[PDB]
Copies of this chain bind each other. A is one copy, B any other.
Amino acid sequence: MDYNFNLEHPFFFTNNDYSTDTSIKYQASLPFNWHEVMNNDEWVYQYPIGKFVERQGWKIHISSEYNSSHELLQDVAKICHEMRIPFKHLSTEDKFIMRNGKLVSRGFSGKFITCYPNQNELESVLQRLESALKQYNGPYILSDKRWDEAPIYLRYGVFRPSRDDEKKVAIDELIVGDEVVKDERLPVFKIPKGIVPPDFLNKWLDKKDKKQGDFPFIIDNAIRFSNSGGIYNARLKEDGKKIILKEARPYTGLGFDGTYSSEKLASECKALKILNEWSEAPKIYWHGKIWEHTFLGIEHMKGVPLNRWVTNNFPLYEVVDKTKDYLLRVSKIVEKLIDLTNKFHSENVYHQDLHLGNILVKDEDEISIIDWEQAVFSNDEKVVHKVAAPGFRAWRETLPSEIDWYGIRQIAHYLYMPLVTTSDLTYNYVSQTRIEGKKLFESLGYTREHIDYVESLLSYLDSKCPQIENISRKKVLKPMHEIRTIESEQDIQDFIIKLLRGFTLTYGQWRKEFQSRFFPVHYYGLNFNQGIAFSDLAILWSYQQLAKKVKNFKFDDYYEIRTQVINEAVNNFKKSSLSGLFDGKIGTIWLIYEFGEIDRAVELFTTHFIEIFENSQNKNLYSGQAGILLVGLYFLSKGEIDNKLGEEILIRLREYTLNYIENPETFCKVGASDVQSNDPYENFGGLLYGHAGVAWLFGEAYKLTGESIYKNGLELAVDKELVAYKVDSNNSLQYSQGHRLLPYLATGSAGLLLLINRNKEILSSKYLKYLTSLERATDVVFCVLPGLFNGFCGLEVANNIYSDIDDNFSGQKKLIEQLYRYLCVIEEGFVIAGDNGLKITTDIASGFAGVAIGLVSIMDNKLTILPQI
């Protein structure tokens, strides 16, 4: 459920073309001399044949409830088929669920039938429609104004695109006066900039009801808004008290089953009425009905949520935790959860939504369960668990009491090893965390008795949930049961063979039911097809680079798919509109060169390099100008081009260096930043984004020829980039971004540790003193993401890469024996869930290609994603 992002669908993600069918339509009984047009796959528009309509005017908005939705069509279309009024309405029932549901914005809420009366015939339309319906009801629809006692709503808007015999006016602008005015969609009603109403509307606009003002609330803030309402922070006006305010507009907040927000609110009110003697449960101070929004106020608990408490108390370092004392607190919290669950299961209530956002941990380790919004009060049935957090949803129908135990089991397993995200893809995934948390806690060094007590508690929690037969089309994905220990190279060969076999299995399931791409990919780059990024050509390149390290692979269908990928990559080369190393046209040239194609790469290179270099805008490594110069310097260093083109490349590289040394602040961000996200085109700090990409180019230019201005620019860039870094309490240098610290390969600490290790012979003694500080920041024991750009593989490919030692067995052993906690299997296979596990993907940032490049770069000591020499 919970679509949008991009969508549902087992295993892979997909584009926004999957919401197909299976709901009954509305089908409003067309007469003759008319016509119905299905245009935007949401609305059917009926035009009377041979009638001129007027641009702008006053639209008519009609709302509806779910139970009596089918009667408004037969009572409004009967009105509109006599005379001549064109109207449009929704087509499928699913979009009627979604339009009045929880997900959509407050601007588009409740629009179900829209009428288009003309200017001189609106009187009879409204006078007939007021006495026509008179009994049905629905939501208010914001950004509009009500009529007297009907679901009729009015608005001044646009009717249709511009006529051929009129001035060309865009959809977003009006024609009031001689000026064009862009309209806005704000939740309150505003007359759009002085449009003169007709004489009959002045009575309906300018009137005022009774001014009896008695509001027993002082609203201070509002933490979050929704379609149902908002959750305010206020105080009572009796004497004092801090209250948490909830509201729910009538006939909205609708779910896929027929159940509104008021029923959930009343269930919350009853459930907190029953539990009215426990300090570790909220209490109700006020229940009422102001106008028709049915306000509820409940008391405000104190503490931090368990999600922040895990990150504040898990040992992420060997030195961050002192005098042990962590597992006994976990056992105490699990014992409190068991006691609470038994106590409110004895009182015949069922909380039915137990995830990390509800348990609040206050001072001295006391819990308090909040958000009793989907409570039920009967246990003899078998229902489907409908609304849940990601990773806390039950499987294949159960009793209303076992959903609480299924929640509590994974809350306890998250507190032992924080990886429960992929539990919506693999059944019984937490057994892997149960197995592999014990190895981590033994390697850190702990008393045995705490481990036995915690494992006894997890066994007791496992014993009170039923094993359910997995029939959900996701049966193939099964967790591990046996974990080995790597002691020789044959285990590494076996793991490599299993990983390529898992890639072979995950190719076919994507290619069987889709054809728009060739490999599945994370949803940030669902529409990108070029560069060292979310793509498809780097997948085959990493597959070749890993398969060359294993002797005599099965070699299924390699050459055919290589032929179509290498043909399709060059077939649409100039149809793109981006230029850059990692996301543009110059990256695929280097990858085509990396397969081979020595004539083809030079033929594309000499034809398109000048046009690619002139139209570039930015000046960073990821999508700017430095990557194209790096590719040109690589091609000059190997040598496949003419002398004058290389002279132009060197002249423009000197021009770039001279522009950089004058003012460095033009094309970067020297600061600390205030926005935190995983978006690729939003971060400006790191190796891919910022000064380290410039320093890599300066190091390559110094290694090519040897001008001292490149060394000066590199030293200036390194001294500028270390301004953004801070020092924590553990004496470690980390990148700073908002309230978060990011030691990672791409956007953080490991990029500089790789860069100053690559140039140890050129740099001097005033710059190498940060290596001990940076190595203490990339020695973590656990991180959530398994990827290459911002995951564990990026941390371990750069911690021991160059080192002037050929000892590579220890790094491979550590990487393989610690990366086992992120995987599942398929049939003698191996697939890796990517950032935000709830997926399987093959892409270079978080997936198969990232760990393939990690193993290849650990073996060959090159980091084969940035060109060098």
Contact = CB atoms under 8 A, between A and B. Distances in A.
B476 A29 contact: no
B27 A476 contact: no
12 contacts: A20-B20, A20-B21, A27-B473, A29-B475, A30-B470, A30-B475, A32-B478, A35-B476, A35-B826, A35-B827, A36-B476, A49-B827
A469 interface: yes
Nearest to A508: B37
Nearest to A827: B35
Nearest to A472: B27
Interface string A811-848: 00000000000000011100000000000000000000
B36 A475 contact: yes
Interface in A467-485: 469-473, 475-476, 478, 481
Interface in A251-287: none
A22 interface: yes
Interface string A778-794: 00000000000000000
Interface string A632-661: 000000000000000000000000000000
Interface of A: 20-22, 27-30, 32, 35-36, 38, 49, 469-473, 475-476, 478, 481, 512, 826-828
Given A30-B475, A32-B481, A35-B826, 11 more contacts: A20-B21, A27-B473, A28-B471, A29-B475, A30-B470, A30-B471, A30-B476, A35-B476, A36-B475, A49-B827, A49-B828
Contacts of A512: 38
A512 B36 CA distance: 14
A49 B501 CA distance: 14
A470 B29 contact: yes
Contacts of A21: 20, 22
Nearest to A473: B27
A71 to B, nearest CB: 15
A14 to B, nearest CB: 16
Nearest to A474: B30
A669 to B, nearest CB: 44
A601 to B, nearest CB: 26
Contacts of A32: 478, 481
A510 to B, nearest CB: 13
A777 to B, nearest CB: 40
B22 A471 contact: no
Nearest to A829: B35
Contacts of A30: 470-471, 475-476
A436 to B, nearest CB: 19
Nearest to A50: B828
A828 B828 CA distance: 64
A773 to B, nearest CB: 47
Contacts of A35: 476, 826-827
A356 B470 CA distance: 54
A792 B397 CA distance: 64
A719 B472 CA distance: 72
Contacts of A28: 471
